[PDB]
Amino acid sequence: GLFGAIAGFIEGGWQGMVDGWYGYHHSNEQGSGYAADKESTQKAIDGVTNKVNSIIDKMNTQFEAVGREFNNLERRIENLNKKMEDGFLDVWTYNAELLVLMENERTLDFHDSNVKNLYDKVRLQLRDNAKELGNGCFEFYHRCDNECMESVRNGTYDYPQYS
Amino acid sequence: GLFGAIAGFIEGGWQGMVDGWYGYHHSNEQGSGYAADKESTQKAIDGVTNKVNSIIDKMNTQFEAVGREFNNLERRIENLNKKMEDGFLDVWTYNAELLVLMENERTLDFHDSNVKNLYDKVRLQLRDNAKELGNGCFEFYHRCDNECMESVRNGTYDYPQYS
Amino acid sequence: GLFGAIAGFIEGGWQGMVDGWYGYHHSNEQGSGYAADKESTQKAIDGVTNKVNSIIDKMNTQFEAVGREFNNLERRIENLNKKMEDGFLDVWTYNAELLVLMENERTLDFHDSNVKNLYDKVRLQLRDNAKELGNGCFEFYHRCDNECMESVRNGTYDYPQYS
Amino acid sequence: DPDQICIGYHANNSTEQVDTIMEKNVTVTHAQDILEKTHNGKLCDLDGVKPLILRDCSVAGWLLGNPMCDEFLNVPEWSYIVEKINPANDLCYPGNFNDYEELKHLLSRINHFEKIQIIPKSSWSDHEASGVSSACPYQGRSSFFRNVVWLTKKDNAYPTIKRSYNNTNQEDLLVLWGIHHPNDAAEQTRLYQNPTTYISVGTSTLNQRLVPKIATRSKVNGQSGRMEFFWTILKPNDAINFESNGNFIAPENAYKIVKKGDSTIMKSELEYGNCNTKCQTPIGAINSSMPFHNIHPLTIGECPKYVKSSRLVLATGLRNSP
Amino acid sequence: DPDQICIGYHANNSTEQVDTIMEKNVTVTHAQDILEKTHNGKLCDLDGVKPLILRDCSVAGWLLGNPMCDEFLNVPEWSYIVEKINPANDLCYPGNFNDYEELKHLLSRINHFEKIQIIPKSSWSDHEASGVSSACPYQGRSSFFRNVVWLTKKDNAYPTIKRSYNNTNQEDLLVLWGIHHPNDAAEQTRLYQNPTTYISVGTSTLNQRLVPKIATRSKVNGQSGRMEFFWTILKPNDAINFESNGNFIAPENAYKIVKKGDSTIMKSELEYGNCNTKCQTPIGAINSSMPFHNIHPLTIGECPKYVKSSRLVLATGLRNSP
Amino acid sequence: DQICIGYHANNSTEQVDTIMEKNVTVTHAQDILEKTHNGKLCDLDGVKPLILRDCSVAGWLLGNPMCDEFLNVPEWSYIVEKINPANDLCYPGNFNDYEELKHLLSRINHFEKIQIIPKSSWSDHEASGVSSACPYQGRSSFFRNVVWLTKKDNAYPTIKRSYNNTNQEDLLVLWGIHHPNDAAEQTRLYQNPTTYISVGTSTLNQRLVPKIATRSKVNGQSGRMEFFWTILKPNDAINFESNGNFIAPENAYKIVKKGDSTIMKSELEYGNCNTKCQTPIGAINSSMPFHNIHPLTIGECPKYVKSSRLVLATGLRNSP
Numbered sequence A, B, C: 001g002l003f004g005a006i007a008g009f010i011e012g013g014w015q016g017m018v019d020g021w022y023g024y025h026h027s028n029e030q031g032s033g034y035a036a037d038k039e040s041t042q043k044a045i046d047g048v049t050n051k052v053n054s055i056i057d058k059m060n061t062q063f064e065a066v067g068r069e070f071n072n073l074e075r076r077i078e079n080l081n082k083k084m085e086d087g088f089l090d091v092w093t094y095n096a097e098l099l100v101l102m103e104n105e106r107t108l109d110f111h112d113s114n115v116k117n118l119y120d121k122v123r124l125q126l127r128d129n130a131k132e133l134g135n136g137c138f139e140f141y142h143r144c145d146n147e148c149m150e151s152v153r154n155g156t157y158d159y160p161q162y163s
Numbered sequence D, E: 001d002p003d004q005i006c007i008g009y010h011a012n013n014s015t016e017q018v019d020t021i022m023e024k025n026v027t028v029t030h031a032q033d034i035l036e037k038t039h040n041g042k043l044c045d046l047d048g049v050k051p052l053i054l055r056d057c058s059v060a061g062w063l064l065g066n067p068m069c070d071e072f073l074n075v076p077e078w079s080y081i082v083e084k085i086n087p088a089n090d091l092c093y094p095g096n097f098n099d100y101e102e103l104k105h106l107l108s109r110i111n112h113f114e115k116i117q118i119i120p121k122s123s124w125s126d127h128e129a130s131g132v133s134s135a136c137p138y139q140g141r142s143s144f145f146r147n148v149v150w151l152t153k154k155d156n157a158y159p160t161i162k163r164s165y166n167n168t169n170q171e172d173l174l175v176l177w178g179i180h181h182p183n184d185a186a187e188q189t190r191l192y193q194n195p196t197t198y199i200s201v202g203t204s205t206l207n208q209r210l211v212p213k214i215a216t217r218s219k220v221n222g223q224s225g226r227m228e229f230f231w232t233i234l235k236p237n238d239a240i241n242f243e244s245n246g247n248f249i250a251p252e253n254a255y256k257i258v259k260k261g262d263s264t265i266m267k268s269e270l271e272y273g274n275c276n277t278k279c280q281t282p283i284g285a286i287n288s289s290m291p292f293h294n295i296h297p298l299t300i301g302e303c304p305k306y307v308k309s310s311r312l313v314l315a316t317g318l319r320n321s322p
Numbered sequence F: 001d002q003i004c005i006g007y008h009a010n011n012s013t014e015q016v017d018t019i020m021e022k023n024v025t026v027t028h029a030q031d032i033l034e035k036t037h038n039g040k041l042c043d044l045d046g047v048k049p050l051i052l053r054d055c056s057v058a059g060w061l062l063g064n065p066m067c068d069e070f071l072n073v074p075e076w077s078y079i080v081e082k083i084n085p086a087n088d089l090c091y092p093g094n095f096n097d098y099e100e101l102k103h104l105l106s107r108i109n110h111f112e113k114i115q116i117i118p119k120s121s122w123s124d125h126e127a128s129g130v131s132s133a134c135p136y137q138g139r140s141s142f143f144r145n146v147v148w149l150t151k152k153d154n155a156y157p158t159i160k161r162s163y164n165n166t167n168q169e170d171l172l173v174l175w176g177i178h179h180p181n182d183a184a185e186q187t188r189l190y191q192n193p194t195t196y197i198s199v200g201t202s203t204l205n206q207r208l209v210p211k212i213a214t215r216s217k218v219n220g221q222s223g224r225m226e227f228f229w230t231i232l233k234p235n236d237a238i239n240f241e242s243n244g245n246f247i248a249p250e251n252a253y254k255i256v257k258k259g260d261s262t263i264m265k266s267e268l269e270y271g272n273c274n275t276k277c278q279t280p281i282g283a284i285n286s287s288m289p290f291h292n293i294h295p296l297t298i299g300e301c302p303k304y305v306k307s308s309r310l311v312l313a314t315g316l317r318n319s320p
Ligand SMILES: CC(=O)N[C@@H]1[C@@H](O)[C@H](O[C@@H]2O[C@H](CO[C@]3(C(=O)O)C[C@H](O)[C@@H](NC(C)=O)[C@H]([C@H](O)[C@H](O)CO)O3)[C@H](O)[C@H](O)[C@H]2O)[C@@H](CO)O[C@H]1O
Pocket: D130, D131, D132, D133, D134, D135, D142, D150, D152, D181, D182, D183, D187, D191, D222, D223, D224, D225, D226
């Protein structure tokens, strides 16, 4: 992926996180578990839903073929009529297929981007208080309890408190 | 945005920086101010100016409707003529609207990328000699003079000196 | 580019790297040489080859003009015919040129991303054991002979042993 | 043993695939199909309104009143019209229908006629109005079109005809008449007495003068003779004036255009499906909330946009790790 | 106490919004509108050349010289032509103009005619050449088209006419003539004496032989008769030959085609604007640097590209924070 | 000691364009636009075209004597006609529904011309009318495939003829009418003053009447000939009746090969070459997906676009 996170430095996805598209796994003394990051997930849902609707709405004024009849000495205009209708059907068919391909690519890179940005959100908070393992995980120097873990997801981790 | 900087780890933009699109805020014992980065701002103006010109030039050759008249026993060809002209108008309306939507998306991401690369240009020069706060700022270990701050904008920060 | 590596933190490309698109330049007690990263280079060629082929296949049902003849009292339909055919030629010329322009941009950015991703793959493995130069290079703290140079390219560098 | 926190993304058992420019068959956690690919294979009512299914009859056969088409003598309101590719029951008496395709184009904007008698058969005192042909059988006896009348000489005399009809109705009126082209001069005099004839027709806009064409032609439905039909739209309060001394196939009934709207003529071999739909094609109806379909380019109703694609699928989720 | 350097980006008081695929109404620091949405509501000169505003006259009324259209007897060079949707002064004497739409199409390539005499009234020694109709009133009395002449019998005779005109001019020449279709045979002899008549016309390419049509027709502008007009383009050094023994509406004046270029016929109810523009529309003129506009699809001049969009705005600046 | 990351640079000056930037130097690019043709009219995949040279389709089909080269042309791939061919209707006039006829030609690859009414069958009429308008070897002649019938012994009895298409192919039948200059020339040529030509098939019901008119001289003649055509189906029959002015069929054309063809307008003549893709200004031998040579092509061709340049980036930005 363009942003190097999905199938990149984070080797694979989590089947255990049934909660949202991106999120966290934590383990500490009290236990372990998955939790979706709700903001980034909701951001992504909105953008992807908007994209799908944009694509449908942009095509809404499409060409619509009509049955026209011609007699045996109107072959030239019958052929003209046929190539015109096919012409537009080919234009719109192409527009739909290419748009879908181009946006499929952007959607997958968007997800990649969101994962990298979520990784960086956490990294910039923790700084020297955790070791960056290089696989998407951070190994704490201090003991981080559930409240401390929640603060990292909140974006409310207090660096001075632990360094 | 895709690159995580604008409305991201740099939470907001600066009213204070009237002078350009991307730049620096500094703070030393002398005084604190705003300085736009010339090179990156100019690159961006060129790319954005070209983009606009390119969009216009691709649409400079495009369909032009022509008034045609038909009598009471030429309704089929009249209809054919109408659908054909409407057909091209719709195709071109779509082409214009969609290209603007797509290029707008890319324009915002382009700006986001530029901010990020500028943040990185500074980061890589400093390394140890500054602290990465995570908000867009670099807290200095040493004292950076008015001269010291200008070498950073130049891209001429002598690292070996300060470590 | 959008990812800041090509003509970015890596100042320029290498004439010495004939065997691939992206790769490494090592230097130790034994010697020095260029080595192309096959995994990323291969990914690139597949991606680029598929892009070219897709672009061709989408345009493979495009408008084909047909000579039609009209007489001196069929000037309206003659004109209608001419505008219809020029219409589709212009539409398909726009589609072709625009797709090439858009995809050339995405192609150059693709390479940039691949170089950035490769750099991070090396960075994330090394961490403390090497010093980040900033020019696209890593000065080792512990000596690395021509065996570990292959392990870092292979992706099999054991961090614990060196720190 | 030390605590840790990890950043990651969703995976599932999805095998859904999408395409991109640089890569095909990419497995993703979620995808959205936007292409309707199925239809019910039937012709249905369109939003509660039944179509006009002409069966073996053509539009010409219907409007002129080919005896084989008595099914359609006073059809109710329709949503669209279905016609086979080559209907068996067209011009029973051979010939042609002038500006036929332009008339068909009018129908595409009409949903209902009220057929009315404008010139009754019983009103022809000095001519025979009972002309029939073996080319137009009905219950095994020679007959003729129902909405027009074959006039012939009476007592070796065809006095010049002069008839007018004033459209005292409020609706536009479709009027039909025709001319008979005989095989030879002997036939001319036998049917119509007068050797040189004409039919003249006038309205506020129509100015027609027709002269028969005697010629020996190949048999069609047993006849070498031809009949050539004509139509006009008579406005409210305009009048149509016929004058002739032979060869005149005169109107009996004409059609009030009582409901204008959106309609179309579909060519289809299918029969009526006892069913209702919002989107109809010549090969079947569509019931879909998809934005695109690939069933058939000719549709009527609230329909998805037609594309030639075999497949359209948008990625919504992310690349799914195996 | 400790010194800091920050990276940041521009913000301002801009409230300008743009759209993207994933997000609508995104506020940006700078934007560029590329769609012109305003016009002046007027019909103007095109780059200093006034249009031909036919007011209440049609092209037919103009060229044939309907007496209500005397304003346009010798119009100057024009940039475009403006006709109303239903011009009141058209064919005062009812009938039709053969290949009218094809003629109007030629007009779209012409900027100026010079009208000239091709057959003077003085050449009609043996026919009356002053026929008029109450269908063509002028100042409350019966008149006729100015550029063609209604010939009738003189001293109870209508000798066969033979007239030629050789195009000695350097320019192509638009020639117009007509035929009168009378109400009945009594009228035919009353006007023209000869009961069976024709009009034959030939050039190097034209080979015509018209025959009038008696038919009983509705009164239009008081007349049940009709007049059918025809036209041809006569090349330099070619000649046109008329022959007739009745029902001939003869040319008097024809039109040299003197200036050819870009033109058009706009349908509009607007009058002249005393105004100049470089881009004109049937609804108003456009003065704009915008590459696109949405005023009307039919324009002439140096114009932006027409789209049906209500809005088109490019982002130039970056996402503006509150 | 030191491991560096980097990318390929080379000595390339190949340039590509993007939305934001023009003339971007890259390490590798791929032109996808064919810009050259051979300037010739070639055989299309082994099959030679019918080059009509100075003859028009009309002159070819009716048999203008200056077009004798094309009396029985072989199977063709495409047809080439000049913009204004000198040898058209030698005797002046017009071809009815000419453009519709030429449209049918665009789907025909071969005719076999046959006799359907021999000259010998005109017992009671002269069948050797000629005109200085149709010189053969600078002497008066006529179209080869139709016949100018005139009165015999000061008489023109009513003609009545049928031809039944007993062939297996559709048949292109041609006939005409002569429009004389005056009433005196009518009687001189056909005796009867008021004449007609009726033509009937299963679908055709035509009655033509001639048109005396004073006309400009074209090729020395003020008279006109108007030609008509129809397609006669296997087992249908065509019936002619006339008492004057009939330019009757002699030969007609079996339609023995239908397929893809076209009528190109070109001033070029035969190039003695072969190609898979042909345009009116020359032929294309290319593996590019696009070309800008000309919009009207026949064969297996790249797709046409109006562009002057079309180059995809494959490699990367090439730093100097
Ligand atoms: C005595 C008699 O009428 N016998 C009938 C046979 O004529 C008929 O055989 C067919 O005859 C055809 C021509 O005859 C008609 C017709 O089309 O049916 C007879 C119509 O009454 C006559 N109608 C009028 C108004 O004149 C009609 C008309 O004259 C011509 O069509 C004008 O062009 O002609 C024809 O020759 C067929 O080939 C033939 O089969 C037999 C068998 O149906 O029935 C007898 O009652």
